[PDB]
Amino acid sequence: SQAEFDKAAEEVKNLKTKPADDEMLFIYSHYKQATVGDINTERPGMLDFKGKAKWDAWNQLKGTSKEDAMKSYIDKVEELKKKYGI
C-alpha cells in the first residue's frame, strides 16, 4: 500500500483548492502517523496555535498503525479528490 500512499501524497499536492481546517489537520495527522509513527516531539509553545493545532491532531492518533494510518490517509485523499478536483 506504500506506493498508493506515495501516490496519495503526491496526488494530494494538486488539490485545486484550500480545504477545511479539520481536513488539513487530518491529512497531516495521519501522514505523520503513516510515516513517522506515534508522535515523538515536544508540543509547540507561545502563540504557535497552528503548530499546536497540528501537534494535538497527530497526538490524537497515538497507537494507530502505519497500515491504518496510510490506509485512512489515502481514502481521505480520495475523498478530497472528488470534493475539490485535480
Swiss-Prot record:
UniProt binding sites for an acyl-CoA: 13, 28-32, 50, 54, 73
Gene Ontology biological-process entries: fatty acid metabolic process
Modified residues (N6-(2-hydroxyisobutyryl)lysine): 54
Domain named ACB: residues: 1-86
Transmembrane segments: none
Coiled coil spans: none
UniProt-annotated location(s): Endoplasmic reticulum; Golgi apparatus
List of residues that carry N6-malonyllysine: 54
Keyword tRNA processing: no
Residues with the N6-succinyllysine modification: 7, 16, 54, 76
UniProt modified residues of type N6-acetyllysine: 7, 18, 50, 54, 76
Quaternary structure and partners: Monomer.
Purpose: Binds medium- and long-chain acyl-CoA esters with very high affinity and may function as an intracellular carrier of acyl-CoA esters.
Name recorded for this polypeptide: Acyl-CoA-binding protein
